């Protein structure tokens, strides 16, 4: 009535209840109906959220994701649960089981990737396990033994197959691989995607989320599915993709996350006495991608830019991805201060009409801003979590705390939505999103 | 390491995670392996624990229990889950599906009852629902519409078939119906139970809990199962039980709980405009059983006594059941003060060697005291919860708070055991007991 | 910026800081500039707020107040601080030092009384002290040893000198004795006060609080100050007041507080082995003022009425004092349900325009309602505290909890105002009021 | 009885109460009787603890200290309260009023300095003020307007007059300037101090703290007081101290604090548009003292060493000051990992007999260890605070969190002692120390 908000203990109870309720056994769905399968970076956040509840079950979540790793090392962005429809495109549309020589043996997966936040999840699992004493340390350490090789292959595939020219930036062949499907970041590269004879299909996402203003448009889905056809024609071969894909972009946010991930995994590798050549490689990649992100930045404002490889041009947009260099470090001192002024100013977290001091996915003063439409404007708790966690790693303890405080205040209604209207705070999209529950559990401690 | 305790937010997350993890779908198991079925007063506590998480799912728990209600109104103490063994005695041993004319149609149940804390669970569901606004009120109110008649039949069967002589005390035909299976309260009535040709059996409880000191003895289980044979020979007929049962005791704690339950249900009946004749009946029974409890009490100390109907004599023991009149009210002023001095003194919560200021199931200075052996000594969070909740109803706000505080401190290790060693605090019995998680969730708010 | 509220630990620290900052040494000012002396029922609340900080200093607050008790047992409503100016009427205007035979020696006080919340403060000090160990328990028990007799004289003076006809209601000779200076309760009685030659004077209160809408009018002060002249003319003699005072009312809210206080003090006397004759007297007065309160009640709603002794007529007004019977008990069951419906419904706590679910001092739908004007409408935390504490004592734990919760939400701006606009929540009157900080400290525990 | 600890809100309220109770008006005593004056780095911590209570009063604390700054820029380590006795050496013994050309007018102070934590307090005040709205931000920014120049003079006096050879390490002329009076760090330097005709005196400190084991010896005080004679003989002249002082050491912990403070103050100067030349100087000193600290470090463990300027030899001792490089950064990566292993391992935080996971002032396995004797072993909350705050600044959020958490667990008895027995946790020295209450308030947020 007068106050729909939950106390911190009630909120944490409700978050954990949701995470257990989305558990199919060995995998957690990203959202009950909209996303009834295991998604890659959702799964990393799910492991973070499970680590305060059960280190064993947190490890099981990453074990399950890594059992779907491709033979070349790629972690695919969807691992389908057996016998669940209601999500399109499903395994039949991707047909990776048929066409992809590198697809895993006893798992149905997608044929594209997603950002490598997994090392961050490993770090949080270990930190939790170190507070719970010997028996629980052993579980976390036995996981390292079993899966260090697989994490290395994941990072090595990113470093070697998606950074072919050693530019220190990750090439994507689908906007879906960025995690920000309809970000304004990809508008001009999608504008050069002309579909051919695209086999018939029926959207399923917008039977669940029926507001047209909160999901991508039909025109946008026709480009998304057409790119799948181009990958399928080359049997998802890494070598042939540069030659065929109509969409090839260097994703500076994905690159900054990879840089952080390598640094984190390198430190884990040192503390647990993993092979020295692996630690050296991880430190090498963290520096290469840190430098690769810095090379994209505006020399005045520090804002990071994506790069359209096909058009051979810098993509200038006003989204939250501009702040990638804040995550990984590396900017000159003056350029970083300017970048923090942009973050805190009226074009983003300082905008006067925002309900919370949180980072909007697109700047509200940008011509591309749409307050309800997914990544074109709404506020995402997963960005809040990622920025706050990276900010604290930079030593910016008070910036990290303020983002955490406002994220808890936004989440304190218990909707656990993936994104929120930035002016009114209305939950948008699907409720019961596992990784919002995870972020809340991590923040509450 | 230095401190295995969880923060209040971590504890509440872990409690809710456990409650969701014990959910089979429509019922919650009392404990994963030891009690892999739905138990009656555990189920009431489970509903209390679920009400802060989901009023819908809390209502579903009570709906499921009430679907197993017998045709005469009795709520049986076990509702078996389909296809689960590992618990003895199971449905085949009870054979209620064959023999009991009143057994429910499409449910396997036991053939005995357990204390009526269910109205208390209904009260907590309603109080939660009133803080969550219109949609959630409707769910709680629609439950009242569907199940008020069934709750009335439950209370009426207790009042009419287990208080045949209108003495205002509940007769039990099995120590299991008290919830305190091996309490010293029943030793002398069990001593007059001589088993006959008792069909062969194998205990299953002590394959799971293998410490012999924490479960009842083999000699005690032979009496428990022999009483089942006596009920089976009369096909669980209410009319014939007084004529055949070797164990017939008036349980003063069960009676005090019934008195409170009637009072609570009567107030619910008034606030939601249920039939006036039902409210009148409930108030009648609450007073009759309040008086029935007071009639058992020592005129000096106020301690309540059980009554062995067969031996026709008062049972004097030093267990927590002595404090039944504190729950329901009714004692003269001086007698109640004396009873509170007994509770707070060195024979119970004031005993110098107790780790927490909590109520031991048997007095530590009693000859019957056994520090590890189930109801002969250990501390049970479910008694802590019940006393604290009833104390606050009496207006004893600070006594209730102190019991709550110490219960949270004991539970703060996250074992969620049903009972604890009273001197060392060691968790005993089964971990992951649903109703300890429920008590914690209720207390934390 | 985005969130003006403090966290619970920040709020608690700011409340304790305010209380120590208003400490003059052995007495706490009620407010820094508006009320720069010790007020009697503020000092009871200050004692409650000091108890979690220092039992020694809480006892000192009450010792200081009781050292200013009159020879006939009356506790005056102001104890003036040595040398302090800026409040009118000051010691010069009261002239109790010269005129009042019963006034204390070497303490300057006023010449009227105020409600007897003091036993409640004594209970909260004892409950705090029992959690703190032996030396702290000794401090509290030595305070009882030396002031029990003074507390009895206080209650005996009320029962014998302000209830001379043993009606079980307290007569007041000044609206300031009710604690609700300008309440609509007193308007018709004040209409019969006709000042004669009133010696001139300048207000001090509205030089500090200069908004005219938040304090009484000049016309009201003329009547307040004339009643002082009438008392002085008979040198504050108890026996002469009924024959000379133009204001003589029975205060049912004061009477219900006294009923509760007698019962509280009686229970203390039993627990700490005080003279049996004293405890009997206290229980006798508890019951008599309970009956006196209930005798006033509306036959349909159970609402309590004040009584004008000179006019011999019931005073019907729509203020929070109507709910007096909820505090002390005594209504038949159906009338108490009606009275709680009145409290929770749209004339009081459930009015739709109210920011908080709290009790306005006057009904927002009464024609006497004024949203800014002191006791004519604003929400007072002291009343929130009293009802919540009294409701918990009645055993209405959820109702007490909801009041506490809204009270803390209102106070979380750290204003510590004594009253608040009911619709906007704007803090009114003086900031830095000790008894609001005290309420907050008691609630946060 | 069963649980001596306070809840977080009770702890916070008791800390704020202590801080206001030690407030003399415009300065806070360090301790009520032991240290009844303003100490310089306590006053920085007091300012940190006041910031969540009152930004205005926090600023006043720093204004009062800076009004006692010497004409050459030095902040003296004691500012004496007008008319206050009971601490020796008092203003008479220092005689700075008569002898010291640079001493302030109309403030009595000591004649030595103390570590420069003050910029850290300024940062915490600014961070608090930015969360509180415009008028509060104006208070903090007006404080910078009027004291920025004084803060620069402070840092410039340290860099130019106590680092005359631009070695990037601060020279001390008295162990009291380190803040660690009787630390084993200084024993070999104090062995070269040979008192001549020392004017007689009586200790005041051990009349308050009478256990001989918790304070320095008479022999140590004879040396402390002789160094005062040497300073007075040259009238506290900076230029003459190197030629006459028998104690001259480079304090690496002080130097690392100064490095951090310069960098903090430089960032403030950038954010608030202070003169660019000032910010350049601050970053220059930050780097120079960082390098000076690292130059001292053990080549295997990275542990920092103090330097005895008269003996020209590195001082190797096993105290917490060895961890200075963790505060300011600068170690190569592999040496910092070794130093953190030393900190967390069995010689310091991981010693098995330690009650809390906190940093003992001397290693429990060193032969200089004494568990009760001031800086020779006990655990100090101020060090816990400094390392946690500095660790968070390095980006080691989990390490900073674990220190905070153990610090709060140690403080939860409400003793507010300045140091604690490391094995039993017994509070030692004076209770009611302001800077421990300050630490607690900052941690609880």
Numbering used by the authors:
A (entry chain B), B (entry chain B), C (entry chain A), D (entry chain A): 2 to 446
Question: What's the publication's text?
Answer:
A glucosylglycerate hydrolase (GgH) identified in M. hassiacum and found to be highly conserved among rapidly growing mycobacteria is likely to be responsible for the rapid mobilization of GG accumulated during nitrogen starvation by hydrolysing it to glucose and glycerate. The MhGgH monomer displays an (α/α)6-barrel domain typical of glycoside hydrolase family 63 (GH63), to which MhGgH belongs. While the active site of GH63 members acting on larger substrates is located in an open, solvent-accessible cleft, those of MhGgH and of MgH from T. thermophilus are covered by a cap domain (subdivided into A′- and B′-regions) with constrained access through a narrow negatively charged tunnel. The crystallographic structure of MhGgH revealed a homotetrameric architecture, which is compatible with the oligomeric organization of the enzyme in solution as assessed by SAXS.
To avoid substrate hydrolysis during crystallization or soaking, three catalytically inactive variants of MhGgH were produced. The thermal stability of the D182A and E419A variants was comparable to that of wild-type MhGgH, while that of the D43A variant was slightly lowered (3°C) [Fig. 2(d)]. During hydrolysis, the negatively charged Glu419 is likely to activate the water molecule that performs a nucleophilic attack on the anomeric C atom, while Asp182 donates a proton to the leaving glycerate.
